[PDB]
Design a protein around this ligand. Sequence first.
Ligand SMILES: [Zn+2]
Length: 256
Amino acid sequence: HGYGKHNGPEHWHKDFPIAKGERQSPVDIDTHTAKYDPSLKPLSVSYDQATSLRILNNGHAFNVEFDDSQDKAVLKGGPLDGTYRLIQFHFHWGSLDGQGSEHTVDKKKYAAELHLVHWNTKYGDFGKAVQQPDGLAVLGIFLKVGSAKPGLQKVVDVLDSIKTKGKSADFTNFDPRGLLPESLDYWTYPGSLTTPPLLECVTWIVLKEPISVSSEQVLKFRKLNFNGEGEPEELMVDNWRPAQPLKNRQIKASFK
Ligand SMILES: [Zn+2]
């Protein structure tokens, strides 16, 4: 299962029937049909004690992993009940600046999309959380090409050391607060993981405000490999799933 022409997202349903489910992600966000919901609370992001451990090329993307054995970096408030711990973040990007994001806004695609994955502490661990309808909370942040994002450069510089699938590198003292936009206004809806096993266990929180990265920064994403060392080289690009039907779901907005 990958993003190629013979094993891309359009084939996934064969191994994972839930791919054609009722709350699949990503989706197109229609800003004019999103419902303003005054009952929604502001997001509470507490990343000040975050402990990054490692960066890994898993063949789908690269993951920056965090210590989630304590409430060090947590997400609360918003549409969430309870405390969600940060476990990892990763990106989806395109082969061109005009595509790469998974979610779209009024059909507009962005250059890339950042996913910060958190799990609901009441379920004890990530593996158990994914089996629950309220197990995960994923914070989605759009990337557009323009000015460089200083807080992203540490990630970019290390990519050379994890070029191929299975490669990992120590990655300590990275502060994820450097990746957040100024405003935390958001849309929220119930959805799924966007890669297999595509479990419908995610509360999506998609920030309205994109961050800017430079052409050179996103360019270095595109030099990674889907393949492992010694195998024929396949550039890691367009690792994004297409928008899925909204079906019986309403997208809510924390702003007007
Ligand atoms: Zn993702």
